[PDB]
Write a protein that holds these residues in place. Structure first.
Motif, short mmCIF file in Angstrom:
data_model
loop_
_atom_site.label_atom_id
_atom_site.label_comp_id
_atom_site.label_asym_id
_atom_site.label_seq_id
_atom_site.Cartn_x
_atom_site.Cartn_y
_atom_site.Cartn_z
N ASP C 112 114.57 7.54 82.20
CA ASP C 112 115.21 7.66 80.89
C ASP C 112 116.58 8.27 81.02
N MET C 113 116.73 9.23 81.92
CA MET C 113 118.00 9.89 82.06
C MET C 113 118.99 8.94 82.72
N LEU C 114 118.56 8.29 83.79
CA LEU C 114 119.46 7.39 84.47
C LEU C 114 119.92 6.25 83.54
N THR C 115 119.04 5.84 82.65
CA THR C 115 119.40 4.88 81.63
C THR C 115 120.54 5.43 80.80
N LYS C 116 120.41 6.69 80.39
CA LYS C 116 121.42 7.26 79.55
C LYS C 116 122.73 7.40 80.31
N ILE C 117 122.67 7.98 81.49
CA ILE C 117 123.86 8.21 82.26
C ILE C 117 124.56 6.92 82.56
N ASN C 118 123.76 5.92 82.91
CA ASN C 118 124.30 4.59 83.21
C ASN C 118 125.13 4.01 82.08
N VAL C 119 124.65 4.13 80.84
CA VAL C 119 125.46 3.73 79.69
C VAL C 119 126.82 4.44 79.64
N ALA C 120 126.80 5.74 79.84
CA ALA C 120 128.03 6.47 79.79
C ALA C 120 128.97 6.05 80.93
N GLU C 121 128.46 5.94 82.13
CA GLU C 121 129.30 5.41 83.22
C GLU C 121 129.90 4.01 82.94
N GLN C 122 129.12 3.11 82.34
CA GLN C 122 129.61 1.75 82.10
C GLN C 122 130.70 1.72 81.04
N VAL C 123 130.59 2.62 80.08
CA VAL C 123 131.63 2.72 79.08
C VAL C 123 132.89 3.28 79.70
N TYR C 124 132.71 4.26 80.58
CA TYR C 124 133.83 4.81 81.29
C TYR C 124 134.52 3.65 82.04
N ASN C 125 133.75 2.74 82.62
CA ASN C 125 134.38 1.61 83.26
C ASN C 125 135.08 0.62 82.34
N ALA C 135 145.30 -3.09 75.19
CA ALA C 135 145.05 -3.24 73.77
C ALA C 135 145.31 -1.92 73.07
N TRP C 136 144.85 -0.85 73.68
CA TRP C 136 145.18 0.48 73.14
C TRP C 136 146.71 0.76 73.17
N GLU C 137 147.30 0.63 74.36
CA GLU C 137 148.75 0.74 74.66
C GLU C 137 149.66 0.13 73.61
N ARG C 138 149.28 -1.05 73.14
CA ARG C 138 150.09 -1.78 72.22
C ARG C 138 149.56 -1.68 70.78
N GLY C 139 148.74 -0.68 70.49
CA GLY C 139 148.36 -0.42 69.09
C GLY C 139 147.21 -1.21 68.46
N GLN C 140 146.52 -2.07 69.20
CA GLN C 140 145.35 -2.75 68.63
C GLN C 140 144.23 -1.74 68.38
N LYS C 141 143.48 -1.96 67.29
CA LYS C 141 142.31 -1.14 66.95
C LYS C 141 141.08 -1.56 67.76
N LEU C 142 140.56 -0.61 68.52
CA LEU C 142 139.51 -0.91 69.46
C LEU C 142 138.73 0.33 69.77
N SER C 143 137.44 0.30 69.45
CA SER C 143 136.56 1.41 69.75
C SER C 143 135.40 0.96 70.66
N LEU C 144 134.97 1.83 71.57
CA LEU C 144 133.92 1.50 72.51
C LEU C 144 132.75 2.39 72.22
N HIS C 145 131.53 1.87 72.35
CA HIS C 145 130.33 2.67 72.06
C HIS C 145 129.28 2.51 73.15
N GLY C 146 128.44 3.53 73.25
CA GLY C 146 127.42 3.57 74.28
C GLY C 146 126.13 4.04 73.67
N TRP C 147 125.19 3.14 73.47
CA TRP C 147 123.93 3.49 72.87
C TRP C 147 122.79 3.09 73.77
N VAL C 148 121.59 3.56 73.42
CA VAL C 148 120.37 3.15 74.09
C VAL C 148 119.32 2.77 73.07
#
Ligand SMILES: [Zn+2]
Ligand SMILES: [Zn+2]
Ligand SMILES: [Zn+2]
Ligand SMILES: [Zn+2]
Lengths: 215, 185, 185, 215
Positions: C112-125, C135-148
């Motif tokens: 369960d923990m590795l599942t959680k950590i894995n999500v956070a690492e993949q978002v970091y990627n 997209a951020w650099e040039r002002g586009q609206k973009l949000s990233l999320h990490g759920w389980v």
């Protein structure tokens, strides 16, 4: 620039010099020649394995890429490894890193270079994974350290491929080596990761990183 | 650094670019893989191409195949060697693509032809990468070449695929395929 | 088209984004692979991300892992399953990276923990891809999320990794790792 | 835009409706569930396999990518296939294409989109390989044809993977299917490539292309 007509003439000249100096040179070479080594090295220009190794011609299977990487999920290099190991039955793989490497330097810079950014993120992950050891070092000593670390990490990745693990498992002979070359000082003698098995990989790698984490 | 050529060749052991081209030391920026491929989606080869073109401003990319290429022989053989077969599928596609021309051929000449065709196809791919195209688009000097080194005599052979623009890529790619498919010697 | 979310999840069979999020039809642009990975050099996943961001102007990217993930279990097991192991090595790296925290854990809680950590690492990627950054650099609206998604009760759980800029990526990525490594429940 | 707080509430609501309407729904599902099908389909939004198939939940392993590709050297999809086939023992793989596909349309346009260009070159190679059949067709009928061709080509690639060939060789049950979905007309009934073996692949594929090359 007409470097091309020059390149051809130089080939011609070289091929003539080899025949006249050894008539059956190409016959001997062209035929049934089985390499016993694989070299994974950098695409950079002053790090040719022809230059760096003293091997007989035809002994070396060769792959080169930016910053001498073995990325777990890279089809290209994994194919070289699997063909070398499973089909050609090569028994030694060498990963050769070097100082003043463009890849390392580019991994460390923040220029957007497009595609090559994606590839170097792997190196940047390695930089961050040893952030402590590198951070407490002097800015311009760091590239040299990252190169050295990188070799150790890539050999570690090599030894964890399904391909290498299986070979070892079914008792095929296979040894991995990680060396680092410097343009002036030559091969840094304190480097050599070396593995013939998963147990040896672990020790060699761990030791190598500890050794590098000395002040 | 400032090497002047990117050399994209095969990993096969007799075919060292340094030895063979006999150039000054440090002239060659090099990629080698099994059967000298340029695959549209291969970060590895592409990263080399990009470093070459955008960082080092190399003006010449050489794709060099060779006679007697194990990769090509494996690509031609119906035999499961493992993971590597998927890599060679790209070449096996090419085999079947020009299967009529290769069909005509005396079986001991087919490897030589597929070697040649393969070089031309890989250049066609290099030439279609965003990397190469943008460099052309924006006026950078960049020429692509496709040769074959003959391991029996040490000699580089031009395949007459040469491109300095998207348009000239088309022209010589088509020509080479036509030339090889139609003519006889 | 105009879907509003890119959903990056696992190929595992119980975890259908459509069913689970219960949204209007056509809201989800979707990638699924083994263990919901974002790998720096994976044309496949990246092409989806790019289509999403640059062509469809999707404003929300969700990376959703799940409890009971076969991928994660295989990543944790020392057992040769073939080609797939190389894919799972990226996760196995993560396992060993946070091996001290996972070491502390009661063995039936580690997946369960590795599942959680894995999500956070993949978002970091995801957040470090040139695609997202430009997209951020040039002002586009973009949000990233990490759920389980929890397969035992049907419930999405926020992992509190959320980024709207490179700087906020750092902030919440670090926080999540610290939060998980230090705190206890 | 706050579509996210809405998305969560909808999940919550859905999960409640499922429990209250079947208490042990999640228990049954969460456990020991082995899929018997793999679906390779497009990331596009109106082509969800949940929508398109009538399968029991937990029966479908799923991969989706731009334009439903099986590229020979793609580590991602090859891993899904190999895990599905070698580990989960799935016995049917479905490649599902669709009309009005963005990937197909983008493959056909000349916009520089960066990375996605590299990926779509594979489709463009398929467009060129059937240049005749497509060229002698009406510009705006062509996307539909390319989609149909594409499915057939990707199934062909699937059936030529080391993974599928081996499974077949060692006599494991494994059938490949290539279907094409249309938003209005539904599944185009004249499509179905279908293979249980290399010999059947060849016939089914060839026939499928011939069938498509009818005027
Ligand atoms: Zn280098
Ligand atoms: Zn070769
Ligand atoms: Zn999973
Ligand atoms: Zn689509």
């Amino acid at each position: 620039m007409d470097k091309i007509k020059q390149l051809f003439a130089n080939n011609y000249s070289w091929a003539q010099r080899m025949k006249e100096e050894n008539s059956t040179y190409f016959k001997e070479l062209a035929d049934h020649q089985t390499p016993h080594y694989l070299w994974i090295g950098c695409s950079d220009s002053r790090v040719s394995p022809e230059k760096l190794t003293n091997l007989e011609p035809g002994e070396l299977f060769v792959h080169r890429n930016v910053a001498n990487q073995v990325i777990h999920t890279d089809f290209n290099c994994l194919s070289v490894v699997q063909y070398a190991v499973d089909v050609l039955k090569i028994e030694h793989i060498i990963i050769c890193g070097h100082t003043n490497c463009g890849g390392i330097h580019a991994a460390m810079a923040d220029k957007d270079l497009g595609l090559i950014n994606n590839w170097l993120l792997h190196i940047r992950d390695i930089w961050f994974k040893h952030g402590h050891l590198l951070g407490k070092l002097s800015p311009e000593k760091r590239a040299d350290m990252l190169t050295k670390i990188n070799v150790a990490e890539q050999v570690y990745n090599l030894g964890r491929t399904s391909i290498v693990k299986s070979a070892w498992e079914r008792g095929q002979k296979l040894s991995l080596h990680g060396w680092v070359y410097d343009v002036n000082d030559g091969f840094l003698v304190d480097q050599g990761v070396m593995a013939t098995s998963r147990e040896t990989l672990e020790i060699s790698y761990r030791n190598a990183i500890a050794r590098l984490s000395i002040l």
